[PDB]
Ligand binder design. Sequence first.
Ligand SMILES: OC[C@H]1O[C@@H](n2c[nH+]c3c2N=CN[C@H]3O)[C@H](O)[C@@H]1O
Ligand SMILES: [Zn+2]
Length: 349
Amino acid sequence: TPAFNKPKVELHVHLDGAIKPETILYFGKKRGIALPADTVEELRNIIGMDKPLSLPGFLAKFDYYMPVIAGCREAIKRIAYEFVEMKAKEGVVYVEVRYSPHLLANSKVDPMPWNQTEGDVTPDDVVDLVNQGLQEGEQAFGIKVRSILCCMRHQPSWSLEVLELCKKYNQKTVVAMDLAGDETIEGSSLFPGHVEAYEGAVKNGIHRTVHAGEVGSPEVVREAVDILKTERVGHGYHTIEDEALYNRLLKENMHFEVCPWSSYLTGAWDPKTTHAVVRFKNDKANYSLNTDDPLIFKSTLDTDYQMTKKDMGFTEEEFKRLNINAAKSSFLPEEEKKELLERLYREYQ
Ligand SMILES: OC[C@H]1O[C@@H](n2c[nH+]c3c2N=CN[C@H]3O)[C@H](O)[C@@H]1O
Ligand SMILES: [Zn+2]
């Protein structure tokens, strides 16, 4: 039985980290592009991981399959459509999917991702492609789906373009901007391209979220809050290491996008210590339960729910509480956010 068989809200899940192993094999074979496995089962086991590594070690899993999707219009729209079908099956009624448009493009991107040969798929085109797949999935499965464009920590020169994309496709699925990738790159939050992208988002009203405190120190979280001006913190487990900052953000009703199973495999969470989400629960903090990268973690949303339930002591009450919280902290407009809350209260009776 699912740990929580009722409607859910997900705010932290990556599109390029939520692809069907079957769809990956399809395009690898179709484009004649090398894959580390020839069957969907072998493919799952090599792309996937079931024991802790590091953030850089986990990020390396993308190198295996991205080449097969990147630069292929048909593939881009297909994974967006299929993502919606995956989530609907999980009991998710509203989802925000994040991804980097540049990492899927093969035209007007520098440096060229995955050694691709120049093509005509621009970062803009991929956003439009994802919009179409997500819209068709919304129509076909009856769940509300939005997107978040990711700035990449190591490539700040793409950040202002990501911002312009968020502006251009505002609410056309695109509801916010994120900062993702390798948090171990010292001071990456403060690169000028990133900083300028976010400041312009504040002045233009584009919503903001940032991965921080996943594997980085509380100072990375503080940088996200103070300089980048985030409205939500992706992961944020390490915040608790600085009592003052934690109690400040807690007092400020800051939303934490928690990914339980994910934190275990990236090493963000030391299994020898009590998970931060337990303290978040005990303090009644504003947080959500997320999958992050279900393809690589060989998981599903129920994975995270069982984890917190069997271990950690979560109840049905908290599950409803954190989901109403996730709905309130969504980057959805007031009219649509109101409709979502009506839905949860209706189905939580
Ligand atoms: O979705 C865009 C990118 O975000 C990065 N990503 C995915 N999961 C994570 C992540 N970066 C940091 N932490 C993780 O939650 C990947 O490099 C993927 O290519
Ligand atoms: Zn993430």
